[PDB]
Amino acid sequence: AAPESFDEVYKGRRIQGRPAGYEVFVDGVQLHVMRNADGSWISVVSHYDPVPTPRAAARAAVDELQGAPLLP
Amino acid sequence: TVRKNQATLTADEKRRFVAAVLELKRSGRYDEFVRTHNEFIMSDTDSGERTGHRSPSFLPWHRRFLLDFEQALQSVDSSVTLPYWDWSADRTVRASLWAPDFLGGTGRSTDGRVMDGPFAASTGNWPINVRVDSRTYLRRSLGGSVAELPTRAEVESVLAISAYDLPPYNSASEGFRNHLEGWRGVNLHNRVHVWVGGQMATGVSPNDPVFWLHHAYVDKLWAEWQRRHPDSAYVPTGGTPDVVDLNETMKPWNTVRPADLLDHTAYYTFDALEHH
Numbered sequence: 250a251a252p253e254s255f256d257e258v259y260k261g262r263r264i265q266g267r268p269a270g271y272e273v274f275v276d277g278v279q280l281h282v283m284r285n286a287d288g289s290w291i292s293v294v295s296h297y298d299p300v301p302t303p304r305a306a307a308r309a310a311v312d313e314l315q316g317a318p319l320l321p
Numbered sequence: 322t323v324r325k326n327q328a329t330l331t332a333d334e335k336r337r338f339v340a341a342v343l344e345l346k347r348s349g350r351y352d353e354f355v356r357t358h359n360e361f362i363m364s365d366t367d368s369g370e371r372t373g374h375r376s377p378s379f380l381p382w383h384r385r386f387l388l389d390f391e392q393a394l395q396s397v398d399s400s401v402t403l404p405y406w407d408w409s410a411d412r413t414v415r416a417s418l419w420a421p422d423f424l425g426g427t428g429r430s431t432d433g434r435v436m437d438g439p440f441a442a443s444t445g446n447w448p449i450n451v452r453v454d455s456r457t458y459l460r461r462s463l464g465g466s467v468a469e470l471p472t473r474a475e476v477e478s479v480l481a482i483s484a485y486d487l488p489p490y491n492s493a494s495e496g497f498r499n500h501l502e503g504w505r506g507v508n509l510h511n512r513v514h515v516w517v518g519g520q521m522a523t524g525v526s527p528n529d530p531v532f533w534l535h536h537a538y539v540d541k542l543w544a545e546w547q548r549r550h551p552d553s554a555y556v557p558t559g560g561t562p563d564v565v566d567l568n569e570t571m572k573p574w575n576t577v578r579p580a581d582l583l584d585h586t587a588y589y590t591f592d593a594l595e596h597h
């Protein structure tokens with residue numbers, strides 16, 4: 250089973266996650282994310298840095314972006 | 322055909338490497354390397370087909386990718402070769418690597434923008450075109466997201482691992498390849514990406530020219546491991562789903578196998594590499 254969905258405002262931005270095998274959005278723009286064998290996650294803007302969950306990867310992407318719109 | 326420690330380059334060698342990189346950028350060729358790497362990193366998965374990362378072919382794939390880039394550099398200036406960055410030694414922001422005459426320094430703290438060196442956005446010579454967000458300037462935060470580069474002792478512990486790779490041949494594996502890549506253990510290659518920050522922490526990490534120097538040293542460490550373990554070789558050696566076996570060819574080239582890339586001396590030597 251995939252992780253649960255989530256939806257929150259983090260540092261002023263809307264981050265959403267949902268099983269699809271899992272999708273993350275930052276202000277409605279899809280963020281590429283991937284699950285590692287051990288259960289951790291990364292995103293395309295943090296692709297060498299495992300974090301425990303997809304919400305953690307979304308939050309890490311908001312931290313990385315420093316307010317920048319994500320590109321599809 | 323000799324790859325040198327970046328710390329040892331002469332002023333003239335630094336000038337020529339910078340100029341060749343910037344000409345590949347100007348002509349459009351550089352950005353396609355960025356794009357190839359991002360496509361593989363977004364597709365290489367632990368549970369499916371994996372070729373450039375999180376798999377045994379991580380090492381020969383980056384070897385051939387670096388050879389492609391070096392060949393392209395040499396088409397602009399045949400004297401240029403890829404230098405390597407020994408991050409176990411040159412581990413501070415003060416390393417001449419990060420001088421304005423070479424790669425430029427860390428980014429400012431407001432937006433991570435690199436403000437000096439030949440690749441600073443203000444030069445007009447380094448637009449970030451292949452990207453995951455709107456920002457079009459080179460960014461770094463040296464030592465921002467992780468405090469320390471690997472140390473020589475940590476490197477030696479990885480080099481002491483005798484098996485090249487082990488099932489399941491992915492980010493959960495024991496063995497040299499995955500400890501070198503960094504997904505298990507004290508973490509060598511992945512942690513350097515995280516330490517530089519900016520685009521080097523992302524799928525489009527070749528946007529920072531230090532990508533090449535990092536991977537040239539990772540590639541050197543593979544060579545050093547081979548010298549310490551003459552009795553160990555690439556695995557798997559046949560019939561493994563989703564993974565490139567020794568004699569299978571690798572995408573995107575389709576015409577070369579890990580077997581064709583184990584011996585770097587066919588293509589280049591290092592300034593220094595000890596004998597077993």
Ligand SMILES: [Cu+2]
Pocket residue numbers: 281282283292293296362363364
């Ligand atoms: Cu990915």
Ligand SMILES: [Cu+2]
Pocket residue numbers: 358362373374
């Ligand atoms: Cu890579």
Ligand SMILES: [Cu+2]
Pocket residue numbers: 510514536
């Ligand atoms: Cu890398």
Ligand SMILES: [Cu+2]
Pocket residue numbers: 597
């Ligand atoms: Cu011996």
